């Protein structure tokens, strides 16, 4: 049993963990489903960021409890809710082919989403590497030591769960970026629809064979939009509340013995 | 009771190559009741009969009736089977038969004979005569066309336009725009088709207005005035139908 070990472990557990990312994920294009995915990630990252601050307050309380446990062997306004779910559209309504094309290729095409995914995946890896703060004691033994080891273990398991959720949001943003490049590949490019409209305008003599291509060009666009409405609907990330740290109150002053010779 | 054969005759006549010239999504549907009343409907817009086309004396157009609510007219837009059904529904009659080609007929079968047409069953000559389009959709307007002497034909129309120059036949574009939602089966293609057809209606009307105000021939402005009055009716019906479903 040693007091300076406890006093050091308290400072170690109270110390700053990784800074979570703060940059917002911007929608890859101007389609409604893309914006809905980006806004869901905005809400998920905001709620996660609040819950990580709550875990920081819990580690502060655990450090205070460790200091009071060390003094026993000598002398030294809202709460966390769930994440809101962006309401997403079902099968999409009719949209003009030129308009769908013009919206699909207006934006950063997934750069902000990739930066979001990079930041949250790095954050994942940093919290994973920072779990030696919650290991057992070398010299400190007994009932209070076992209770403190249990509290540290609960904080370790919560931190690892938080890392898994950070990885999940990163993979969500990555998925919407891949879905957008598939949509850019499969949907008719704007130059082709404007050129087709102009080629009907040049020879209305070809008007009886331009219409089966446009229907073809419509149908695809519509597969794209249906899939982009269905697959860019992201589940909100609901983190668990951080477990309460053990509360150890300050002890009464120690009785000096050998007193009264 | 009789004239099922006359119904299939006119049903073959609409289905000729005279006016079914590669229009994507255009088809006709002909139907007759137990009374013997003949009703037709196409799949382009509301109260549309093509240019210079006539219908026989018994024939009612389904999308052109006044005893039928405009909201259930617009509900049946571009879906001509449902149109002749709704015509029979409020007009109290039971449909004896529906004629056409079975691709068009795959939608509905409530006690209907489902008459199928083949490439020999349809002759490729239209050859039918009857009422001009103004007399089919607006016989009130066709009667005050007929009491107008050939000099006073400008009393039916609004004044001569402030532009003396012709407006420009952009109709080959607006028609195209019109055919664009007909390549879709998404919810809301009906309404977009009706908006593009309303723009085609208004431009056609302005062209007929200028055509009557610039010509000096009897039959020529009678064509132009009848065209103007027809597109006046069509623009009004499309505006009411687009407005009633917001």
Residue numbers in the entry:
A (entry chain A): 9 to 84, 113 to 297
B (entry chain B): 484 to 729
Question: What does the paper behind this entry write?
Answer:
Mycobacteria have up to five specialized secretion systems (ESX-1 to ESX-5) that transport virulence factors across their complex cell envelope to facilitate manipulation of their environment. One of these substrates, the ESX-1 secretion-associated protein B (EspB; Rv3881c), has been postulated as a structural component of the extended ESX-1 machinery. Once secreted across the inner mycobacterial membrane, EspB oligomerizes into a cylinder-like heptamer, favored by the removal of its C-terminal region and the acidic pH environment of the phagosomal lumen. EspB interacts with EspK (Rv3879c), which is encoded by a gene in the RD1 locus downstream of EspB.
An initial low resolution structure was obtained with EspB2-348 and EspK484-729 from M. tuberculosis, on the basis of which a new shorter EspB construct was designed (residues 2–300) while retaining important contact points in the crystal packing. This improved the crystal diffraction and led to a final anisotropic resolution of 2.3 Å. The crystal structure covers residues V9 to P297 for EspB, missing E87–S112 from the PE-PPE loop, whereas all residues could be built for EspK484-729. The structure resembles a sea snail, consisting of two domains. The shell consists of an antiparallel β-sheet with five peripheral α helices. The foot of the snail is formed by a compact helix bundle of three α helices with a loop containing three short helices connecting the foot with the shell. The interaction occurs between α6–7 and the PE-PPE loop of EspB and α9–10 of EspK. Analysis of the EspB-EspK interface by PISA gave an interface area of 652 Å2, ΔG of -11.7 kcal/mol, and a relative low complexation significance score of 0.1. The EspB–EspK interaction could be abolished by either shortening an amino acid side chain of EspK through a K663A substitution or by changing the hydrophobicity of a side chain through a F659D substitution in EspK, indicating that both residues are essential for complex formation. EspK binding to EspB prevents EspB oligomerization not only by steric hindrance but also by locking the PE-PPE loop, preventing it to adapt the more open conformation that is required for EspB oligomerization.
